Subunit: 113 residues, 2 copies
């Protein structure tokens, strides 16, 4: 799981509002939401940041996006939504465990930050 | 015509020019014509998928390949302080071209919320 708060969430050591879980990822609502619906999809494998993901991680990263879009449909986001991965300081990455943001329920604007 | 006839299908088939960063059998990376950051490029599959909400379960590897190519191109472009990847879905997501595309933006501090 890793040495971050997201590792604690994976290990069920602190609570989170879990939306979906399987053997390789976990989706849960963001504790500081930026849209009426704002959740995260994270791998259970501790990849600290997208910049260090290996080629063998391709299917896992794609799995996060497929889970993300299936959860978005399940949460009723039929008008659309935005998916975000942050990397590093300029990207605004807040936890050094790879995570996919999914935001919806309001108009998302341009530029995306 | 393989890839469809959105602007991105035309770019895939070299019918409309673009500033290409990387190309392989599965995807194409090229700079955005209206950049929202000092570096702003797109990674698209060559397979036509209109939007992420209709991607199939067996598109997992392809979607992940977009992100791996995105981060490898970011490194090759010297985005050593980081970057943001964005996929827009539908009207609320701000989608304007219905051929799946991953944005990669960097070269400045990105703000929160992401739009």
């Amino acid at each position: 799981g890793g040495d971050t708060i997201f590792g604690k969430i994976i290990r069920k050591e602190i609570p989170a509002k879990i939306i979906f879980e399987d053997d390789r990822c976990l989706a849960f609502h963001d504790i500081s939401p930026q849209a009426p619906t704002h959740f995260l999809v994270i791998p259970k494998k501790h990849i600290s940041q997208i910049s260090v993901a290996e080629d063998d991680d391709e299917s896992l990263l794609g799995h996060l996006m497929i889970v993300g879009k299936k959860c978005a449909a399940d949460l009723g986001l039929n008008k659309g939504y935005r998916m975000v991965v942050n990397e590093g300081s300029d990207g605004g990455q807040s936890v050094y465990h790879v995570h996919l943001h999914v935001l919806g329920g309001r108009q998302m604007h341009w530029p995306p930050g």
